[PDB]
């Protein structure tokens, strides 16, 4: 904290930095303009950024910005790829335009494809973003069950993005929509991952009959950084089951070579370069990040903190079970169901539903009592909504 740096950003310029191991990292704009990944900075507020936190603040038009605290590293890059992300959007936005001339109309989608750490989840933040400050609302599509930015692990989520992203804790988690996949990778279940997307894609054409905003408003589909075999083709039913008008290909030539051949001809395809900010994470870094989404679904955040339920339930009062290729399988309490989430199906009885139902949310089994027939569970509210508990694969060390 009594270590300060300055910097001056020339226009269109990122300052690029990491904040320490143990040190939190606070970023003030003190003059000019600038954007975090789409959403605007306001002049002379605090940023407080927590440890191992990957930034780059971006300016249109100049700024000067100040950092205090200890950062690993800290820099001006003067190349960056974002009058591409700009282009995108405003491709996007004229097609909203053309379509919208037709009075109703529905919106342009994207899919986002490519593999890890190419800044793919970064890019369609800044692009949901960017349709907001458009004053359209889009449809963020999270694809990525190994990383979702919307709910929980092993979840395929669709949010409706009405806000810009806070620039600490990303965009508002307000009533998504959530499919329970139940496993980190599509690897584990490539069928039933495959059905689920499916099944969002149906559920989200029905709910855009009814809000016109959200229609016009398009999709912005981040997928996972499966690639390669079987990840391929799934990228290709991604593209069918949604639609799709654009497929933008992050830093992956031969990816894009392939989707030119077998994607219809309406489709443009459009190949990007990842941004010389973002790096290769290591596997433990995913794993370490995966526990950390789970605490921040139950506990919330820094600015804002949410505050779980620890209550027993009684096994009689619950149906547990587990989907697994595509079966329905009833469980029996056992000690193995300690330390995974559980999904409150929205489905009413433990059947065919379960399957293709959306969840109400997520708990965390924290004890299980099979001498007295009770488990604890962490739980974001008073009451369980559901009777129904879908097995997760996921499971979480609080
Ligand atoms: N221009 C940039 N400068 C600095 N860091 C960045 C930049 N773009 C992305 N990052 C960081 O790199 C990390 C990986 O980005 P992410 O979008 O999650 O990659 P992917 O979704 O393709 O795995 C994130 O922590 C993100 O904040
Ligand atoms: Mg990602």
Redesign the pocket.
Known sequence: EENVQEFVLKEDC?L?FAAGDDSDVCLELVKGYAEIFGTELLLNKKYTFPAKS???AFTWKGATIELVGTTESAYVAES?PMVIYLNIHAAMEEVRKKREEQAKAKGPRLLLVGP???????VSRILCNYSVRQGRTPIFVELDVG?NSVSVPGTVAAVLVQKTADVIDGFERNQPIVFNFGHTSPSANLSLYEALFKEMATTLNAQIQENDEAKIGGMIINTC?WVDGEGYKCIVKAASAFEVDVVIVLDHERLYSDLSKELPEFVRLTHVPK?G???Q?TGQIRSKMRGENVHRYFYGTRANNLYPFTFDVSFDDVTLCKIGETKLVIMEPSADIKHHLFAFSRSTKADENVLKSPVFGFCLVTEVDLEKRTMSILCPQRTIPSKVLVFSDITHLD
């Open positions: 990122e690029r990957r930034v780059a960056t890890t750490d190419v800044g793919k989840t970064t990383q950084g941004s900010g973002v790096e994470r």
